[PDB]
Ligand binder design. Sequence first.
Ligand SMILES: C[C@H](CCC(=O)O)[C@H]1CC[C@H]2[C@@H]3[C@H](O)C[C@@H]4C[C@H](O)CC[C@]4(C)[C@H]3C[C@H](O)[C@]12C
Ligand SMILES: *C(=O)CCCCCCCCCCCCC
Lengths: 17, 127, 120, 17, 171, 547, 81, 88, 156, 128, 459
Amino acid sequence: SGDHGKRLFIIKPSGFY
Amino acid sequence: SGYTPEEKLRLQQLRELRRRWLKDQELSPREPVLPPQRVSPVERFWNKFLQDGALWKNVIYKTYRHSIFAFTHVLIPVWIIHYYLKYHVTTKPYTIVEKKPRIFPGDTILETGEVIPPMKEFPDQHH
Amino acid sequence: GAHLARRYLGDASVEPDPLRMPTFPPDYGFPERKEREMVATQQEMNDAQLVLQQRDYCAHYLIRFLKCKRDSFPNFLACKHERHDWDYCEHLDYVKRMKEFERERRLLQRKKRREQREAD
Amino acid sequence: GGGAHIEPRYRQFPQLT
Amino acid sequence: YLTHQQKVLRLYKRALRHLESWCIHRDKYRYFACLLRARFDEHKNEKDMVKATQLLREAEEEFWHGQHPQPYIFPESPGGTSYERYECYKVPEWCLDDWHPSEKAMYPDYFAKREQWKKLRRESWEREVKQLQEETPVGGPRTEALPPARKQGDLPPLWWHIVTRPRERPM
Amino acid sequence: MNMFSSLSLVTLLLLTMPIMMMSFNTYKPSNYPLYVKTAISYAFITSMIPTMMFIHSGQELIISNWHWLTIQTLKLSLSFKMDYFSMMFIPVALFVTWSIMEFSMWYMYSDPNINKFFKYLLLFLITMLILVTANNLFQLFIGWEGVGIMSFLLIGWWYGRADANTAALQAILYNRIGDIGFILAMAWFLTNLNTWDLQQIFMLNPSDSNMPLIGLALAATGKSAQFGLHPWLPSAMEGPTPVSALLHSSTMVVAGIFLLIRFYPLTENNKYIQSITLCLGAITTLFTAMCALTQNDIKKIIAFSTSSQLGLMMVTIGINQPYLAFLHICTHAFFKAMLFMCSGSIIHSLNDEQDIRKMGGLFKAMPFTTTALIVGSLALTGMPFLTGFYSKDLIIEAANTSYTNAWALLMTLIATSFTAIYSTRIIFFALLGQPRFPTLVNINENNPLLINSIKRLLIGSLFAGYIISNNIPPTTIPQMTMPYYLKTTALIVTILGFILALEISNMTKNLKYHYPSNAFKFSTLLGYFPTIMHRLAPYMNLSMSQK
Amino acid sequence: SKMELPDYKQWKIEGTPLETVQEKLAARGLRDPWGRNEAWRYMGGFANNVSFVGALLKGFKWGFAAFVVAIGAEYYLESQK
Amino acid sequence: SDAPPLTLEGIKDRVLYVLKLYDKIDPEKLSVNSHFMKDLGLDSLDQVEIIMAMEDEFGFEIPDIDAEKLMCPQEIVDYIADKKDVYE
Amino acid sequence: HITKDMLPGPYPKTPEERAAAAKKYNMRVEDYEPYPDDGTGYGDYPKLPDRSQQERDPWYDWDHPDLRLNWGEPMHWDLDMYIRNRVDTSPTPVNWNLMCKHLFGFVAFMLFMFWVGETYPAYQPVGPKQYPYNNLYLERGGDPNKEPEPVVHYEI
Amino acid sequence: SFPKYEASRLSSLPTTLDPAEYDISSETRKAQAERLAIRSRLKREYQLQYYDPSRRGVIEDPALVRWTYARSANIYPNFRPNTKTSLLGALFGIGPLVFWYYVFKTDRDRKEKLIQEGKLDRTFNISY
Amino acid sequence: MLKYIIPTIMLMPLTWLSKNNMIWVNSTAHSLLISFTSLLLMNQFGDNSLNFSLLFFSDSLSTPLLILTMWLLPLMLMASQHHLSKENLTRKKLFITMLISLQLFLIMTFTAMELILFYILFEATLVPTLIIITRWGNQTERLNAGLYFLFYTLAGSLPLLVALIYIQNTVGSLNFLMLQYWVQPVHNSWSNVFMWLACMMAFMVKMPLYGLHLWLPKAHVEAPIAGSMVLAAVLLKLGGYGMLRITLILNPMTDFMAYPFIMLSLWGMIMTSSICLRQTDLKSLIAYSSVSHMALVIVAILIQTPWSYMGATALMIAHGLTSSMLFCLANSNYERIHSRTMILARGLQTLLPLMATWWLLASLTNLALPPTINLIGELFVVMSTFSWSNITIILMGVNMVITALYSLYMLIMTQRGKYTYHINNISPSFTRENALMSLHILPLLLLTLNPKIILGPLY
Ligand SMILES: C[C@H](CCC(=O)O)[C@H]1CC[C@H]2[C@@H]3[C@H](O)C[C@@H]4C[C@H](O)CC[C@]4(C)[C@H]3C[C@H](O)[C@]12C
Ligand SMILES: *C(=O)CCCCCCCCCCCCC
């Protein structure tokens, strides 16, 4: 958004199920 | 004093462990690898058709996205509501009761050609 | 409240009680009182669809205000003048309300002097 | 986010437009 | 515990903040701040332990009726505007295991290194047990302080979650 | 007729269509946030077509469009009451919601659950509109709870924050308490009377309606945050600002007064309700401002600043002004909600800072924010011809020129000036003085979307309140005649608040030490009602439960 | 990105009330240890700021100038019927 | 709020520039790793004032226990870098 | 799979029995003492301070900073009611009795003053808003069969 | 002046006014150290499981179980003829019940006669 | 009524003759299937009930409870198989068989045309429960709570047997249809006062009644999830059934004998609600919560008003659907942390998104959110008390408040909070777990669309 890239990984609950 | 040599040396490890560790949170160019997914051509139509923009040719797209709402989300329900209203509601007693329309001087009624007697002449104040 | 102050802080009897007002005979020395007419009879008020509180003597003017208003649609700045006819007519009633009170106020104050000498 | 069209300052009047 | 000497500071910094909110204006704040620090420097040279011990009772009995009606508090600190506002979004790391395969297929590279991160979470664990048994007093460890790793390639025991603890802003 | 009724019901069902698209399908992600807003945008238009017809025809339509249930001699339906209030209160709520709609599409960009965020924002709107349009207590009851529940989640959006969990239940605790009178009212109209349809209730004109109305009095005590059940309303400011902007500033808080207005024919004759309601606002309308004179929280202050306006509305009903009080509802909502959004602009550029004492130097460093801050305040303080003044001058007419309690008029003006007092204390720190925010400058509001949000909600207060006055038809005998000072007492005491606060504000510049004062803390600490009643009462109920 | 940080002697107390504390501090026999710390709250482009009177009168010059024209235009548009 | 990024290199002067306005220090003698008590000839009471400035500078409170030990600018950077999890 | 002896039991009436209980919950013998022996029957549990969780420092890195409870620590018999969510007993800003009595003043002050104003309210010195037609007897639905008392409010 | 706050169940005293903590002698030094080491050992004992990869489950806290165990106090303590609490405690659980016995009963007895004489309004009452 | 009894029986060979791995499926498939035919029982008539034969019959009141029971057997199986997967093959058939019989007795119970036959089945219904609770119990603490069930027989069943017998000798029959026409005015006497206690104390304990509830909190603390569901969803509802029917013959004596019962609930409701806020267990909190709702029913039945009966019917229905779901919802956590403590695990919305959706969903209707049937009945009853007595609104209002206070607390304590750091086995929600909750919440709302099916017989 404001800056190109600068993408940080997200830890999430496993949403598949 | 300060972080004792063991603490400061420890912190060097702990902090750098975190500094190096936090670097893992970016992503490779291929990642996040998402599958191909299908595309609807009319969306493809705008994808190539919107690679230019232009004055007259940009509001047209935004206008088009505003054309869907007019009939899909508004006109259809009122047909559904009114249709249901027309036969499945109005056909019942006292399901809809509307206050009798107001009455004013100098008014005529369509039904019986009725007449509203004009009020008495006012005392003629300054006006 | 001068009227509020003078009543109780002053003698209470002189001031007529606002809730019981009026409290003295209408013809307490007040002869030949012309009647207050009603331009719009029971029928017109009924068909006017007006709140009873909105209905009074001056309301016969009030009918004129909206009659233009309904046809005034969509604009709203077309019936301004007609409003003052009712409002000013309403304005007169408020003064009358003030004048109506005093005839009750005067009698209580006047009657005090008459009775004061009747037993002094 | 058009490429940081506003560059924040430090102890300064804002870089307005 | 903590001694009264350090207890002096706990009122030095805190008293300012209530004074700070009272001061509001910047020129007032520094000037009034100088007034307070000047009072501190009235007794800052006082080296009498009985008096220095006795020169703190009134200060605490003095500050209570000067404390702010609505004292200021920093956002991220406890009681602040952003007090744990984002804890609802922070996600535990250990839940990585239950990720569905297809979900994991999006980030093949990142998970590859984790296996080594956990690798030293397992192999180093055994020696980490002994690493405390030379710095382990009888009668239960005296304090909760921890040592570093006195070799190369290992890490100070009891480190896994803090190093892997999520970041401040999940989004 | 057909067109008028048919097009009217579209709004309630139209607004619900996006909701039906959240539980089903996965056709288009990433576009729902705009989807909802356009629906309100479209809904507003369909909310203005009834506006034209209603004013011209004044067609109050009660539509019974179902036969849900039937007990012995009862019948419940999913009916609606298309009348003055719905036709005139719906357009404002959508207008405010439309402004807030685009406001939230920017502020909450930091929330991955933004789509969930709108899954509930649109829900509350639905319930509120159903509430006002409800023709029966039951259906009306449903909205009375939907606002109660939809607030619960929206209040506690960040479920981690202990303030949210405690505050959210605090309001729910109070909100439920109000319903006790509500359920009582249904019982009385079911025992003495026999139905929950307003047609029978008003026509029968109960001769002894103290008990049913007493329940109505309680209903507004907690739901509208009147004194005695007030504290929760400020508590909502522990969460999202946009959430507070609509629920607790314009839409939910109006519930308490609304019921009394909706039962205007019954409330007139019984003065027992009027006095306590008149006094209830009296104690609250100042207790809010009296507390608010020295509060030091931007969002909470606005809440208190809103509280007094709400506290006075009861007095407006307490003086038997059915349709005049209604105006204060719409008029207040515009700017105050904008003030929430304006407070959002401050918090945005401040990067999560809210202390009123940590703000300043924003006249030119925050040009657009400064622009609309004064209008709401001036309109809030009663600037002539502005949205807030019309009610403020009009409302004070009857109260000061009609039968009223001696003490009731006492706090009526004392707090009236206080209304402007905190505004100056706010615009002072907010706009006057050199900057006092932290060293780094994060100030930036060149965001077109918000400007659209501010644009839409900046206009209404200036002009819409003026426009709203013209079309509405006569329903009362305005008290245009009264002593000049009474007609202008507001025009006299209004300037006092600014100056008197200005007298208080500027003397604090001087480099002179401060001095504690009990009253400085009694008002600052909220009169100790929350600080006390929210410790022992939980302790009483819970500490004594085990035995 | 690079965030060029300006010179650190720009912040100063001369000509601003920050030194007025210093002037009164001579009678107090001390000095502010952070004299140059908070010079920005009156420097950097925050020297002049309209007070309460100015806030309400923000931009009223143009409206005031245009207001007279508008009211007169009624006479212009009404004198000729 | 768009993006308030944080960089160690950018933060470098933010901690040090705080010292650059101190009236009890010679700017040139000061170093990135200089101990305050010995290298800068300062005291804990003087050190308290420096710690406070960081809270007005950056806007986040500091615990009393850990404030004391931050006698090195790098450590102060570590506290700011480590608490916010800034690594680059 | 927990021993019988390491569970709440009778009231210990001698210090020797009290030795286990203090040790049982990891409370030193000095800090430990149970409720008085009575029919209350709260067992050999300790008598912890009547304090809330928010009072405890959060800066410490607890196992459960959410509760500010550390593993192995004892729990107040009603620690569930003293949790951060529930009743808080943190230090108060203003004097207890005065705080309670500060509420008493303003609220007690207003109620009676209304009754004082009720006897002498405020109004304007004007007559009734006169109405025609027998004081709107028929407009109010008055029975047409039984005419009301004649009403004529004369001019003036 | 500065009237010291009256310590109350709902208002804990400020930390820097209790005379106990100003002086920290062996009578306080000894106790303070013992708790930390005892607390440390628990942390150390818990630190193994928390940072041990092997565990896949929920720690069986011994403190929690006893706290839950003590709540379910059924017959083990207490004596039947203990006049201090049995008589008065039993009142809190049987006292107010009788109070309602007359409250509603009186109205219904009161209410019934009115109906028998028509002294109460029911003209438009059906739901009963 | 045979068309539902025999196929219920036929599940027994299916539970036994079936293959090793199809034991669960086969019963599940047909058990769900049978309930479909159960819906046929909604062929009520305005003036007369449905009288099949001399052995069974179902009126308007009976059917909704019948549907719930048949609708509830498959749901009980779904939850069961997780904890039974480790059990050996033969026992699972044993446990499953008891449920089939348990349903058999229940369906025959509510449809019984003769009171004694109802009395017989009433006693039988307990036997499967005791095995299920005891044989597969969750505890080994030997509470020695037999006295309560001994007290039940002494103060409950056994007196009821004599009164039922006495009525038949005097009146001449115990067929409810006959009772409708041969009911006689029970004048006031010490004997009748004793007879009255015989007809009601038996059903009061099972509801249960405040003071007599000591078994319920300890019954759920040990009963497995399979046993718990039927207990609160069906078994508690037996008393109201008989009480509604039996009270046909106790007038006018009930006009004054009800007060000690009414006061027990009117005040009992608040007491239970408050203690829940203090409870330290997900199941136990539900236990007293169960007593709360059941207390409202007791008042409705005794006053015997046309609205009371209508509201009472839904309260049993909604509560049965409510609590049953809550146990399953609560037992979802048990499948991970293997505990009943409510504070051991927190902030589960961070790890079980869709699980919290049920939690919020179920809790909403627990506190009688409108227009759901949880509130239609509860709100129906509140009005009826007003005609009986206006003061009652105070206690109902307080009860609703506290019932609204703890209901959200349990949700707040667990889902709205910070995750337990040490817990490391919060696996994603399984299809079975989510499916089980969904079958509960959905129909619970659907009946709100059409209230005419659980309005009771007075409608
Ligand atoms: C039928 C149509 C699918 C069109 C497609 O193939 O993408 C459906 C699926 C996605 C929907 C759209 C998306 O929800 C968002 C579109 C853009 C704006 O939000 C207005 C509604 C909006 C115009 C919607 C109209 C209609 O409901 C859509 C267009
Ligand atoms: C009370 O409500 C108003 C207080 C002022 C009373 C006015 C007294 C002085 C003027 C009285 C004579 C003129 C009539 C207003």
